[PDB]
Symmetry: D2
């Protein structure tokens, strides 16, 4: 069908597997379904206060290899068990990082990292990976950049995050008010806290947004509202993790009529884009936690099997278990890190 | 179909008329299609620096009544023909205003302003309105809050705008890189200029984003980049229209390899939310324009048949031709203001 | 998507405008909707036994030109009004004739009679034609060859027929049990009556059949049973119209527990494929009717503006208002034949 | 969406999993794909006249239990391997038997035999069954009652049949002209042979028919013609298997330009609805074959693990391996009847 003045800047547009196809091929096993249900209920209590543990969303910056991802998941699953009594460990399974610039479009948009853009392969690979991880008993945390992807993966998400650059977007807020899991809004790029707070209030109400039915047709979604949303401090022009800021944030939250709780992102802006510094932020935060700090309900750490990152866009033989986006701490620091956190929660415990 | 851990916060979700249904029922008449082709070409020239005229996106804050909206159009169309050598008048046909708070969800989401949420009626009403306006010879400018609505109306848009709360959203940038019309990114809420500049650069590159085919099915869209994007100064905590700022902005664009050009929004934050102050901003801006400021390729004015706004909640029978969202200057000030700008453009010519 | 051992004999398969698109573009006008509502009730009243009037499905064998079709309609409409007291005239608007062999695939499958197979144009042309006809006051009768087409046109059909070659088809029976209009089953090709009788029974029950939603998705339809079905005698190896056969048929019907009512097809096998002989059948039948025969509720006549038939694959240009499938009596004989029936109906009455 | 005069006799209509969902969940394993490809090639050589082996479509009348069907399959696969130089054994996997009104609607329409009508469960169950059967090495033969089901299972069918009640239906002829597997048309109910002969010719040509894309959307299909179609003699008011009839048929075929070859159904009308008599028909037929009849390229036998049949309406636990539709010869007679047929084929060979 040819319409006038239509699709002028569209190189190409093609049907995507309908959600139902992905659900039918990779249905949630009984374990996977449990892992999800339980991890959601658990995060709900921590946010409701009825639990003194720390939510810990730790994992690779972005996932580009299911093999490494599942090995990583295996290790993280062990620690999840060990520190089970203090922490509620959840894997950060993110498939793409929003780039103002160019770069790899992620596991879903371009599974083969060769600009082939086999997105239907992406969905398959992505969903199977989440399915496997959840099946093994390890909950997963993911990000939601648009209003359509949720239909293919939300049911395997125990926790999700609306990034900094979209926290103020009405549509993303409306989306969050309909997600079946706890949502965490990041503070503005420059460090602005108001946006995230308003977001939290908006997510709590009922909304309408366009997306697609599980059969893939365009649809209007009417949400109920989501009360399990909290803020995520990822720094601005200067870190947000200091007790000085926590104090500030705790203020604004109550001022807005929302529980004074926050999650702290050791990476990104709080890490000054230096994966090494995540260990330092851990120091300051662990102290706050142990020194009787309750408002902090969770943290976020970018870690992989191998520290640092590597250039994919330079035509280099990628190394296994090493992030190809933001730099992540190695598995050594990750363990030490988690152990410290576990204790700071024990200290604080009283 | 019942899935585990699914749609826990979804009150309801229903099929939405596929785009093809709207296109088939309301196809572009030959006039409408010309109107759209021509006005897009015109704005392209102004943005390429080959037309000393001014792009003027003027019209109701939000449209809630096709009748008034069509009367308004008839009037604006007259001036459009009159001042056509100084200005390139384009009607602001917006259907909804993003709200944190509560409020009417707009003509599309709730055509009957009674929370009946007859969105399929919305699309028919909206698309038929744009169709009529364009058919009369008056181009229309709209805003795009999501990645799906475009499919139902973009072909009747001669110009579009990515609002302040979304200018930094990667998806909305990607979406802009695929629209068939010039796009205008607003500066951040607090006044931040960088976010709109980065946006402009990104929208010029080819991107991938999910949406739906004209047949209504979940699809992946590959754009080809949009070079007809510009910034829109709508003020921050303090107005942006002063030659002081304009000078800063022009510097930012040039430093980012972009043409020093800007559109100035007389309303919203530049008007301090006082519809009457739009007349004042007009003074200062007509000043710079007459003075020979060529970085100002266009302005935006919220105006209706009758000035001021009114409420829906009040229970009093809505007043004809009067905004139910942001306050707008009446038709009298409008005719006045347009004639000033007309002269200002002449001034900058001699 | 590439599947093994799949589509080996498919030259090509393409999406079809979803029904909703055709409904949105060509909604039934008031006059059209009523014309259908009244014609159905009226035919129902007849099958009920409370109307001595005769249902007369008369019209071109197949329609290939909207212009001649609407002229024909205009004329038939006049008579429809004139003989309103004795006959319930309904136009036969058939788009295709099932051919073992080759030949034109009909107005819908190939609107342009040039093998271009523009089916989406067919749907639009066909639907608009029925819409105009109805809007003028003339009900329409059509045939249903598959389970999908109904979704695009049934709402404009006041009466439908399941042809001889499909009367014994389970799917077509299930389909008829869900049509919103009276359905008429024809007796088998060789003259068999049992098949049509079983069909009338089966169609009276609720069934399940696959088709598509108004949105174009594959769906499961659950009908509620259709009690307005009757048999159509179209002859076998030798005509069926004689009182001898009528008598046997009425008996078979009662024997099967169904009302003893029949519709007689003057054309096809009862006419021995001799369009002229339709006038003779009219004589024998008008006789039974005038003689008190009440089981005859209706008749079917193939007639056009110009009698006879012409060949499409003959390459030769086409003569206006002349069938390109089965030969039809001209408009002169039509007006004559209709009036005869009118009188025969008066006879049976007064 | 509510339309005028629409869906008046529709109790309900719901989306059906799109084909792509079944294909994604149950993709053909390599073996299954081979089994299917090879058996189609084999049956092709037979019909082409380049193989003296006999095609044997034997199996339950209908399948209501995957577990027994798989046991049957295992037994039959063994004989398939043994008698492979004489017979090309293909399992009859039919899910439903057309009934005038009352009765179980089949494994697909009602998997749970409790009127729950879990058709999506049907497709999953049916497709998985065919998938496992083919994967084990046993080809499968099925029937196609509508134009939509093929999309979900045809890729697992090595041979298919158009039943007696639909052989004369144009849409089913068109559909056969597009199937990727050899098709068998059954003679009319009353024994008529012409209808199946015409069908074979029709299915040989290219046609158009509506159905749905693999994505589930209403679509128009353009076939390329099917040359691997043959007749199936299943008796009329009296059996068709006698050499007398086989002689008439062979003439009818040659008279129509078709190779004189037939498949003889030992069951149904040829068996006078007496499962025991299938053994008798086998006698007369093995006779003809052994006596040098090269026109008999195949036979069809209704057989299960246990002879006879049983009712659902009875209310007693169902017997394992026992038809709930037409009566079938049990397993012992099957091994018998096959071994006979094998020798006959061996006979005719020398
Ligand atoms: N299925 C999502 C909700 C959703 C519905 C529709 C569109 C987008 C998201 C969930 O369970 O979280
Ligand atoms: N059709 C739109 C572009 C578009 C396609 C697909 C999704 C979103 C937008 C235009 O002409 O601008
Ligand atoms: N819409 C048809 C019925 C129908 C529904 C679905 C499939 C086929 C037919 C009618 O009103 O008569
Ligand atoms: N896919 C089927 C053919 C088919 C396509 C579309 C509709 C119906 C049938 C086959 O391989 O035989
Ligand atoms: Mn990162
Ligand atoms: Mn406004
Ligand atoms: Mn005819
Ligand atoms: Mn049977």
């Amino acid at each position: 069908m040819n319409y006038q003045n239509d699709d002028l800047r569209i190189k190409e547009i093609k049907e995507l597997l309908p959600p139902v196809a992905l659900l039918e091929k990779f249905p949630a096993t009984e374990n996977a379904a449990n892992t999800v249900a339980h991890a959601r209920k658990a995060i709900h209590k921590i946010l409701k206060g009825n639990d003194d543990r720390l939510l810990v969303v730790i994992g690779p910056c972005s996932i580009h290899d299911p093999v490494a991802a599942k090995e990583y998941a295996t290790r993280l699953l062990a620690l999840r068990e060990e520190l089970k009594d203090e922490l509620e460990i959840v894997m950060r399974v993110y498939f793409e990082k929003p780039r103002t610039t160019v770069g790899w479009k992620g596991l879903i948009n371009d599974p083969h990292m060769d600009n082939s853009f086999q997105i239907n392969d992406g969905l398959r690979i992505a969903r199977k990976l989440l399915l496997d991880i959840n099946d093994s008993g390890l909950p997963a945390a993911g990000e939601f950049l648009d209003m359509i992807t949720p239909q293919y993966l939300a049911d395997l998400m125990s926790w999700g995050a609306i990034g900094a650059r979209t926290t103020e977007s009405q549509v993303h807020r409306e989306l969050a008010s309909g997600l079946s899991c706890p949502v965490g809004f990041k503070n503005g790029t420059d460090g602005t806290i108001k946006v995230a707070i308003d977001a939290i209030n908006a997510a709590g109400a009922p909304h309408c947004f366009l997306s697609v039915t599980k059969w893939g047709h365009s649809a209007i979604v009417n949400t109920s509202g989501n009360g399990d949303c909290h803020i995520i401090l990822r720094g601005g022009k200067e870190p947000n993790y200091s007790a000085k800021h926590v104090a500030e944030v705790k203020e604004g939250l109550n001022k807005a009529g929302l529980p004074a709780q926050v999650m702290i992102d050791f990476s990104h802006a709080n890490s000054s884009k230096q994966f090494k510094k995540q260990m330092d932020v851990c120091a300051d935060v662990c102290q706050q936690i142990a020194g009787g700090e309750k408002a902090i309900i969770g943290v976020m750490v970018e870690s992989h099997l191998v520290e640092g990152n590597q250039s994919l866009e330079s035509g280099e033989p990628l190394a296994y278990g090493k992030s190809i986006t933001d730099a992540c701490i190695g598995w050594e620091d990750t363990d030490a890190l988690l152990r410290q956190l576990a204790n700071a929660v024990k200290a604080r415990r009283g």
